[PDB]
């Protein structure tokens, strides 16, 4: 079943891919791998071919490579970017060094759309509804994105949306939950709900909600709207030093959101209050938010599916580089493409 490969050097870097992928265009580099846009003659789709060149330089790298492949092979949902293909030109484990991941390159990112257009409240309802539909699926497998922001949401002309680029580490901080920013405690799935509130708030006002400079600055901005922590939340902060820093602040009441978002759909503002709650344990879940009156036109409890269970037991495994590499190789080989 090995397809025919063709090789070419694009921008001082070698790509060896199946002939099904045509007209490769370097669309970016990084520190985690180069990316090219291409035409996938098999599906007729425009796709992103991501080459990981350095996959196994450390235990951290090898493990993160395996984690990214595991996550991506598990994602089967309309509002979540899935794996269209994964391949290596290697004919055996011994010569295995490069891994390539292929995903659908749909529309443009939300940040790009907003730069060229003022969305209506209607767009906002449907877009946010799609993010939460995707998040209910993800959270049901006990997966946390961890890095949601406009640049990680693909949107097309017909308003379809898919969540992409999951945080693989185990502007950017402007969407992060207070408790994960300073690492106050072990994170809840609702750190993604906090990012959603930040995203929606910005879509409605056309202004970034918490545009802080550093952690303290951003924390202060956050706590001014949402108020400062109480005893309940303080009991949950594991770090004694963070708790001492928290108590040193001058107390701040929560603000009323209705004065901050005047003229916005009142239901939108109500959902915002439920998403942007300081205590993570009290933030609305994605399943609950889908049931919120703001999405009345779009809610269908018979079509907001959950995921199969995702085995994260590997996270606690303590293995050698070659063992993580071998597990990764096995996952490439076992990959079954989507219809």
């Amino acid at each position: 079943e090995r397809p025919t490969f063709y090789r070419q050097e694009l921008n001082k870097t070698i790509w060896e891919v199946p002939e099904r992928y045509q007209n490769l265009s370097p669309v970016g580099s990084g520190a985690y791998g180069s990316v090219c846009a291409a035409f996938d003659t098999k599906t007729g789709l425009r796709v992103a071919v991501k080459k990981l060149s350095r996959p196994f330089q450390s235990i951290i790298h090898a493990k993160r490579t395996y984690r990214e492949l595991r996550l991506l092979k598990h994602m089967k949902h309309e509002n979540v970017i899935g794996l269209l293909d994964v391949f290596t030109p290697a004919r055996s484990l011994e010569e295995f060094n490069d891994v390539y991941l292929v995903t659908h390159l749909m529309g443009a990112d939300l940040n790009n759309i907003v730069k060229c257009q003022k969305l209506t409240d209607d767009h906002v309802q449907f877009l946010i509804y799609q993010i939460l539909r995707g998040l209910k699926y993800i959270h049901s497998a006990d997966i946390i994105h961890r890095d949601l922001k406009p640049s990680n949401l693909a949107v097309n002309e017909d308003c379809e949306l898919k969540i992409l680029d999951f945080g693989l580490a185990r502007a950017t901080r402007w969407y992060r939950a207070p408790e994960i920013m300073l690492n106050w405690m072990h994170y809840n799935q609702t750190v993604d709900i906090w990012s959603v509130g930040c995203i929606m708030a910005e879509l409605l006002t056309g202004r970034t909600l918490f545009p802080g400079t550093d952690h303290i600055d951003q924390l202060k901005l956050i706590l001014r709207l949402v108020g400062t922590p109480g005893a309940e939340l303080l009991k949950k902060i594991s770090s004694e030093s963070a708790r001492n820093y928290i108590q040193s602040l001058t107390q701040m009441p929560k603000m009323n959101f209705a004065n901050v978002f005047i003229g916005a759909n009142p239901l939108a503002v109500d959902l915002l209050e439920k998403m942007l709650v300081l205590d993570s344990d009290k933030r609305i879940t994605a399943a609950q938010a889908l049931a919120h009156a703001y999405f009345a036109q779009y809610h269908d409890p018979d079509d907001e599916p959950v995921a199969d269970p995702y085995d994260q037991s590997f996270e606690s495994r303590d293995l050698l580089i070659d063992e993580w590499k071998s597990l990764t190789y096995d996952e490439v080989i076992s990959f079954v493409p989507p219809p």
Binding site: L119, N156, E157, D158, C159, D300
Partner: peptide, 24 residues
């Protein structure tokens, strides 16, 4: 890209939601 008006947009999800909204 420019996003069409939701009224003009057509996709599988919207199609589905519009089909339920009539079976009602």
């Amino acid at each position: 890209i420019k996003i069409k008006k939701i009224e003009d947009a057509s996709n599988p999800l919207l199609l589905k939601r519009r089909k339920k909204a009539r079976a009602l």
